[PDB]
């Protein structure tokens, strides 16, 4: 299944933390990275934001366990690995809200996602390209 994960880091020099985190995501079992977006500089010092496409055979909460582990291990206020989408699934549990409960209100999540999945359709049928048009979120600057 293709999971889309958002990465956020607000360290002054976040590149090594993000690269450590990306490598770790690629080491998750029954999973592999498909594509990584560019790194974007976004106002809060700045955040570095990126999106990752991860193919995985894991269950959603199993993926969550891994992302939470990486946050603690690669964490140093903190590093953030948010599950934006999991296939076309709707998840509403105590641990997991998928799609991410606010991503549609955040240019810093949608723009890096649009770079790597421009044709994305949300589970409720909304179109990523349309949200970006209607909300008129300024394109982000690259890190
Ligand atoms: N889609 C999702 N991705 C990651 N964590 C999620 C999630 N949906 C719910 N959570 C829950 O969110 C909890 C708290 O996560 P935090 O990372 O501290 C919130 P945040 O990412 O700082 O703010 P945000 O959710 O407004 O982006 C986790 O313990 C996890 O169970
Ligand atoms: N610019 C920017 N702002 C944020 C971000 C983020 O990734 N980028 N993440 C947040 C909570 O998870 C709160 N605010
Ligand atoms: Cl949705
Ligand atoms: Mg977050
Ligand atoms: Mg989070």
Number of continuous H segments (helices) and E segments (strands) in the chain: 4, 8
Instruction: Name residues contacting ligand 1 (CB within 6 A).
Output: 80, 82-83, 95-98, 100, 102
Number of neighbouring beta carbons within 10 Å of residue 74: 20
Collect all residues with Cβ–Cβ distance below 8 Å to 116 and sequence separation of at least 6: 35, 36, 37, 51, 53
Technique of determination: X-ray
| C-alpha of residue 82 to centroid of ligand 5, in Å | 5
> What are the phi and psi torsion angles at 56 (to 5°)?
-150, 145
| C-alpha of residue 96 to centroid of ligand 3, in Å | 14
Number of neighbouring beta carbons within 10 Å of residue 6: 23
Look up residue 100 and give its two tokens.
Answer: 């991410």
The CATH number of 1-143 is: 3.30.70.560
| Collapsed DSSP state (helix, strand, coil) of residue 92 | strand
Domain ranges of the chain: 1-143
| Collapsed DSSP state (helix, strand, coil) of residue 18 | helix
How many residues are present in the chain? 143
Angstrom resolution of this structure: 1.4
Residue with tokens 């641990």: 95
Residues 24 and 83: beta-carbon distance below 8 Å: no
Catalytic residue annotation:
76-77, 80, 82
| Collapsed DSSP state (helix, strand, coil) of residue 95 | coil
As beta bridge partners, residue 86 has: 3
Residue 39 is classified by DSSP as: P
């Amino acid at each position: 299944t293709v999971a889309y994960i958002a990465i956020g880091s607000n360290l002054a020099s976040p590149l090594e933390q993000v690269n450590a985190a990306l490598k770790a995501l690629g080491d998750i079992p029954e999973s592999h990275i498909l594509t990584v977006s560019s790194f974007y500089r976004t106002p809060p010092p700045d955040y570095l934001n990126a999106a990752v496409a991860l193919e995985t055979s894991l269950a959603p909460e199993e993926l969550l366990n891994h992302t939470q582990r990486i946050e603690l291990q690669q964490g140093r206020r903190t590093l953030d690995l948010d599950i934006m989408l999991f296939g076309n699934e709707v998840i509403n549990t105590e641990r997991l809200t998928v799609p991410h409960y606010d991503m549609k209100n955040r240019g810093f999540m949608l723009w890096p996602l649009f770079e790597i999945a421009p044709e994305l359709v949300f589970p409720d049928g909304e179109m990523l390209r349309q949200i970006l048009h209607t909300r008129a979120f300024d394109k982000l600057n690259k890190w």
